[PDB]
Every structure is written in structure tokens, then in C-alpha cells.
Symmetry: C5
Subunit: 206 residues, 5 copies
């Protein structure tokens, strides 16, 4: 019957932040889905935008699992104590600005959830943001160094209200958001890398 | 018959900065109260504002208690040596800029007070800022990863003037500040999360 | 017979950065003095100014003391290895940008001197900066978490022109500088906190 | 039998981040090539540009090798656990802003690949950015403190599409990219320092 | 029988980053000379300029020496493993932005060379920048906490074209560069602190 202190202590002794938790020779299945919170500074002339979004990220890591028969079955853990997938947005033109406490939730079964609220600038198509149809800014996110056999990424099944969390005070409104998985091979490299492309159709209010 | 050195040393020997100090299976009660110091940048067109405030924060941690019968009963402690609630402002569009030494005040019975002065940018209703009625900007703050059964937040009904510490050189002025407590279940997640909503009614001086 | 290496090693092992060096039941006496170096960007519309100054800060930590009858008398020491008063500028609207190496000077008797050059933005009265009488910007600095019985702050003065180190290439000039001492009691807390208030009377150069 | 945990621990135990892995008495051969992702800011008046690019960097460190017969032959390693060349862009006017996770790939034979995506501002020729032949911005990269007898740098034959990774949404477009090596002796210092000069020929597009 | 790993190993044992390496009771002789790379943001209205420059800095530290009879006689070392003089630019209005890897070069005889390329903004005389005689910007650099008896700073009057490294794409050009050594006694303190003043004569092109 251990408490949270013991659950945290066993996580640091067994957890290897630098070691991807693959099972045998299977890829670590990572789920990525964005929940837009705000659109702050659009520029149609430069095709750049400033977005704020929650980056819901989940994966399994057995090396963390613990017996919660008679103890807390879930805890908040600092990401520096866990292996976290090395995701990056291909068309982001600034480092992600993590606005929230960098803590993830870890379940006794090893399921991990990490959902930081991020503000980041992207290079995308802003043409038409000032029309009825609007603009569609696509954002691609995938593992930076782990190819398809080590990390697989797919859009979460969840499909909440596109703007269920979006700021009603933004100068913009979300028309629609679609997610689409991809598996690409680049000439630079022999292996294929997976990514999830999120298409944000939005327009200036009026 | 200890001194401040021993008090600090002991705290390092029992404090678990990454372990939420829950008593029994009950939530840690955190009190949040904002004292506005300044309103630096307001943009009605973008509905964005820059505010400086003291975030009076209190909670209890019995793992820090000590016998002060023959020693001081209070000491300043760097927050990095203590567990601190993972609070985040939901509508913040910038990371908080802590303008003061990051030290908390710990009392012998375990009571902790951390009151950092913060400059942060928010996304809120700025409409009417130039009218006599002014604008009403709501700031939502709560635990980012600890649900209602782990952390509960409540407003500090402290009796004092809202503009008691507000700068007299700001281009704006405070008309009224109210603080209400909320509890919300989001579609993203199973448990409920609490937050304190602080409503700042202010306007440009005449 | 000891060298600097011995002295600096001893200082690191005995000095406790998180323990205020109070002696007996009396407060640590801290002296503070500002020597203005520049005025970079003033804004009368927003009552905001950007200043560069040397903050001469001194205090005692007798535990650091050592017999220098047969070894160095003084040594430069990184402030992170020393306890330093948690001073804060109450009306500052940006964090201090320390321009100089963060080293303090420790004399064998335990006297500590720290004089960083700092650029910082403040919210103060800028009205009249374009007039012959100029504006008077007041800066308030004092311990953030240590009350009057743990830390004391007092203004230091030098028999030297207020503009002796001021930039001749600045668009502004110094008319006068005065420093008063205060002991304010805030409704937030029971004890009183001291502060040094420095008044800067400056104006745009003809 | 070895797993990733064994390898990463061994790498971190044998790798010397502050010791250039020169073999015998030859210099470490570092390969550098840039893959342009975007051109964000251009000022023909000041001759300053803001670019985003993948700085592909490869070199060998034999001590990192391990028998991959019964184990993985490739792993991602944080660069803080490895010695990496102290490359610097001579004409850069801002610290490089690394946009991606700072991880390198280490192969069982000791081959290392580090390819960060970087946004950085440079001082180069921007004249003609609105012409048909565009401007040609030269970026010079080489080791900051290791001379030619310690580190050598060569351009990788990027015989691929120059705009393969370039953003289709940039206000600019790439016409051509060439790379050439140089070995320079400055009057400041007795030894020669090698570098790779990347020539970016680009221009503003038309409506 | 020794290699680079051995050399670095010995250095990170005998070397004390916090201890100035004085010989006997004499001061550490430090050579400082700036190689201008670019002039970027000139403002004649505010007497401010953004300059990029290699800050060649040399000095000796015998505690680093080693027998190079059968081993390399030079190695690149992170400055965090070495004592480095605490130089500061008096009229700089921003912290130094070090653009290059922070490595110093150490020779077997204990000679050290540290030459980072720095971008920094200064407050200096910009008047005349648009004339033929041009503006003359004076930059002052010296130890911050080490007085004449601990550190002396002298310029390296080497015949190196003032524009060898200067960017041919700058909007400005270097007419001439001169150096001058000084020794000052600031009202704040008894000792005298040496500095080198580098006068930069430049002008707009054409
Ligand atoms: N994520 C991708 N897809 C193609 C290239 N790349 C980036 C990448 C791959 C491997 C290393 Cl060590 N560094 C960066
Ligand atoms: N504080 C809240 N309320 C709804 C979502 N959320 C943020 C959150 C919750 C759990 C984790 Cl691991 N990360 C971020
Ligand atoms: N010194 C000041 N200024 C405003 C309030 N206060 C006192 C204070 C007391 C305790 C803690 Cl943790 N922080 C600040
Ligand atoms: N890469 C080059 N070429 C000439 C000068 N230089 C930079 C350099 C060389 C040595 C040290 Cl310790 N610091 C900086
Ligand atoms: N070099 C300078 N410039 C202004 C004052 N000073 C000398 C000095 C002496 C002691 C300490 Cl702790 N700091 C600085």
C-alpha cells in the first residue's frame, strides 16, 4: 500500500528519459490532436500566423506501470522525468512557447498523457482569411528523429467541438478543423516519417 | 532549540517538491487572490491586455511542519525546495513573467504563502475600455493537471481596496474586481477541474 | 597562510544561500544606493521609462569572515554561492537585465558588496519631462519576503555629483536625485516591510 | 543481447562531449549541407535576411561503435551526451534559434547525424532580390575553434531539389543553391580554418 | 603518454573557475582588443548603435599548464571549466549576445585565448555618422570587480587591417580604430579599475 511519494520514487528509478519505450520491435504509437484556443496575429502578406493550442499527446510506456491495487492509480509527473516523443511542427517558424506547467499524467497501467498549451508561429496559407470561405492553415507535426518503425503518429479519435475551447474574444473564428495522418519518405533519409496534418479553416470575424 | 539553518535543512530532508501533499484522500486546498498592480497595454481591436498583479497563493503542507517552541516560526524558502500547485491562467497568451524573487514563506505549522508579482498578457473582453462603464476582463486560473479531488481552488475573501496597490500612473483605473469559484468538466477529460475567475472592470482615465 | 582558492572553497562550504544571516534577534542591515548611468526610452503618454543604474548593495555575513592576517583580504565571489537580500523594485514592469558579471566582493570581516549595473523598465511619473522643471520618477526597492525584523534597508549617499557617471550621450539629463527611507505595512500581511525610495528628477536635454 | 537502454547508457558512459574524437593524428571530417525551409525576412536596404534551414551535419566517432548483431544499430541521442563540432556561421547576426528537438542519430558503426532546423539572421548580399536573377546570399559555416588539422569540413553532394523542403508559402523562391569549401588563414591566427560557403540565389515572387 | 581526454581531465581537476590565477602577488595581465565584424542598427537620434565584434581576450593561467613533450600542446575547452576575466562594457545597454560556441583555446604553457563574436548595443557618440569625417563611438571595457592590483587590461596594438573581418555588406564602413588604456577610481570604491577604450570611427557608405 504505497502512497504518491513511493509511486514517484519508483518512476525515477525505472524511467529512462532518453530511452524510447518500444515493445519488442513495434513502434511506440503516439496520438496527437490539437485543440485550438486562439489565433492571435495573422499576416496575409507574409503568410504567417500565431496560434495557441493544446497539444494532446498520449502514448504507453510499460516501464512506468505500477501496482495500484491499494494505492493512487494516477499521478502528475514532470516531463523531465519521462520519455516524451520528440515531436516538432515542420512549418513552425518559432520555438514552441509552452505556457503551462510541464507535467504529464501517468496511469498505473503506463498510459501517459501530456497536453501542454502552446503558442507558436507558423508559415502557412493565409490567403483569403478576409473572405467568407476563409483561409486554411495546415500544420504538420511528427517525430523529428524517429521514423515509422520506432514512432507512429495518428489523429486522436476524439472529435470535440472544433472551438469548444476556442476564445470567443479572438478577432477570428474557426470555420472547421480536419486532421489527416501521413507517412512520408524524404530524399534526405531512407526511412519514412509519420506526421499528422491539421487543417485550420478560419476567417476574420464580421 | 534549532535555528533558521536547521529549519531549512530539515525541509530539504522531508519536502517532496514533486509530490502533492494530500492529507487522507482529500484535495489540497489552495487559495488564489489577485491584487492588481498595473494595466500596461490594452488593445480593444485585438482584445488583449497586459497586466501586473500579485498572485497571493496559500495552501498547507504538513510535511514541512517543525517545532517552533524554541526557534523561529517562519522562514523564506525558494519555491524550488517546495511542492507548489501547478496553476495556470487559461486565457493567458504569454508565459508569466515573475518580477520578484521566487521565495515562499513557510510557517511552522505547515502553512505556505507564495505571492509573486506577475506581468502577463491575456486574451479577454476589452470592449468598452474607453467608456464610463469600462471593459470587463475575466482571468481564469486553476490547476493545469490536478483535478477537483486532488486540488481545489477558492477565492480569498480578503477585505481590502481593489486599487489599494494599483499604480496611480497607469493610463487606466480599476472600477471593480470580483472573484468567483468554478468547477468544470471538459469534453477532453473525465474528471473535473476547478478554477477561480477574476473579473477586472477597468477603463481609461478621463 | 591561505590563498584565494582556500578562501573561496571555504566560503562555498560555509555560506548558505538560502539562509538569511541574521545575528541574534536583530535584522540584517542592508544598504542600498542607486547611481544612474542612462535614461534610454521615456514615454510620457504611458508613464514608462527605461533606466540603467548601478545598485550598490552592502550587508554583513560574519560567518563568512576569516583570519586574513596571513592571506588575501578580499575575494570576488559569484552571488549564487552567497546569500543575497531578496530585493525587488515594487514599481518595475520588467525583470532586471543585469549587464555586469554577477560577482560580489567579500571582505575578510564578512562585509559583502554587490554592485550590478542594471537596465530595467519602470512605471512612474513621467509628466513634465519636456519642461524646464522636468519629471520626477520615483523608484521603490525593498525586501520582497523579509519583514522589518529580518531585513532592514537604508539609503547610502556619496559625496559626488549625481551625474558623475551619467551618459553624456543620453537624450536626457539629471536635475537631481534624493533617497528617502520607509516602513510600509500592507493589509496583506501583519508585519511591516522597509523600502528605499529613490527620486529621479530628469528632463529631455535642451 | 542488447536493447536501446544498454546502448544509450554505454554511449553516455564512453562519449566525451568536451573531447574532439580525432583518430590517430588526422582531423575529424565533418560534412555540412543546408536544406532551406523558408526565407522570412529580407531587407535589401540593410542587407539582412531571416532564414530557416536544416543544418545537416555528419561525422564519425569510432569509440561509439557497438556490435549490432544482436541489437539495434541506430538510436536517437541528446546532443548534450555527445561531442559535436563547434560550427558557427561567420556572417550570422543572431544566435541560431534551434526549432527542433536537440537529438542526434548514432549508428552502430559510430557514424553520427545531427540535423537541427534552425532559424537565424544573416548579413549577406540582398541586392537584386526583386530582379529576375535575384539576390545571392552567401552563408559561411565552419568550426569556430578547431583549425584544419583538427576539423575539416566538406559539402555533401545534395544532388536533389533545392526547394524540396522549401515552404510554398514563402514570399520568396529559390533559384539555385551551390556549396564550395575554403581553407582560410586570417592574420589573427597562425593555423588555417576550413569552412563551407553556401550560396543561396533567391528572389521575391511576382503577383 | 597523454591525449586530449587526459589533458581535459587534468584541467577539470586543478582548474578553479572561481579563482583568479594571480602569479605571486602580481595582477593577471589581460589583453583585450576588438575586431569589428559589422555595424547594424545606428540611431543618431538616441546615440545608440548595434555592433558585432570578436572580443579577443588573452591571459595566462599556470594552473592549466602541462607537459606537451609527447602530447597535443593546445585544446579547445568550454569556458565553464576555466577562470575567465570578468570584463564588462560600461556603456553597453544590453547583455552581450554571444553568437559563437563558448570555447577557449588553452596552450600547454597555460596561455589562454577566448575570442567570442558578440552582438551588443552601446550608448555612444553617433553624431556625424552621415558626414565624411563620420561618427566616433567609444567603447569602454574593463574588469568589473577586480582592481588594478588583481587585473590589468592592456590593448593589443597589432597591425591588422581595421576591416579585415568587417562585413562588406554593412551600410557602414570603418574609417579608423584607436585604443587607449585607463585606470579609474570610482567614488564607490577605494581601488582603481583599469579599462581599455576602443574608439570606433565609422560612417554611412557614400
Ligand atoms: N523528421 C524528419 N523527416 C526527414 C528529416 N527529418 C529530420 C531529422 C531526422 C534525423 C535527424 Cl538525426 N535529424 C533530423
Ligand atoms: N486543466 C485542464 N482542464 C481541462 C484540460 N486541462 C489541462 C491538462 C490536464 C491534464 C494534463 Cl496531463 N495536461 C493538461
Ligand atoms: N514585501 C511585500 N510586498 C508586497 C507583499 N509583501 C510581503 C510578502 C510576504 C510573504 C511573501 Cl511569500 N511574499 C511577500
Ligand atoms: N574560426 C576562426 N578563424 C579565425 C578566428 N576564429 C575564431 C576563434 C579561434 C580561436 C578561439 Cl579561442 N576563439 C575564436
Ligand atoms: N568596475 C566598476 N564599475 C563601477 C564599480 N566598479 C567596481 C566594483 C567593485 C566591487 C563590486 Cl562588488 N562591483 C564593482
Amino acid at each position: 500500500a504505497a502512497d504518491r511519494a513511493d509511486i514517484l520514487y519508483n518512476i525515477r528509478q525505472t524511467s529512462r528519459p532518453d530511452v524510447i519505450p518500444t515493445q519488442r520491435d513495434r513502434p511506440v504509437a503516439v496520438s496527437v490532436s490539437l485543440k485550438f484556443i486562439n489565433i492571435l496575429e495573422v499576416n496575409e502578406i507574409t503568410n504567417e500566423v500565431d496560434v495557441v493550442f493544446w497539444q494532446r499527446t498520449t502514448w504507453s510506456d510499460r516501464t512506468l506501470a505500477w501496482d495500484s491495487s491499494h494505492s493512487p492509480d494516477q499521478v502528475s509527473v514532470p516531463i523531465s522525468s519521462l520519455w516524451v516523443p520528440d515531436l516538432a511542427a515542420y512549418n513552425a517558424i518559432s520555438k514552441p512557447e509552452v505556457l503551462t506547467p510541464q507535467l504529464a499524467r501517468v496511469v498505473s497501467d503506463g498510459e501517459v498523457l501530456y497536453m501542454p498549451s502552446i503558442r507558436q508561429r507558423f508559415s502557412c496559407d493565409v490567403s483569403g482569411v478576409d473572405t467568407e470561405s476563409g483561409a486554411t492553415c495546415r500544420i504538420k507535426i511528427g517525430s523529428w528523429t524517429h521514423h515509422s518503425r520506432e514512432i507512429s503518429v495518428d489523429p486522436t479519435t476524439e472529435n470535440s467541438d472544433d472551438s469548444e475551447y476556442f476564445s470567443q474574444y479572438s478577432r477570428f473564428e474557426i470555420l472547421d478543423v480536419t486532421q489527416k495522418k501521413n507517412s512520408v519518405t524524404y530524399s534526405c533519409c531512407p526511412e519514412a516519417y509519420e506526421d499528422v496534418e491539421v487543417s485550420l479553416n478560419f476567417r476574420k470575424k464580421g
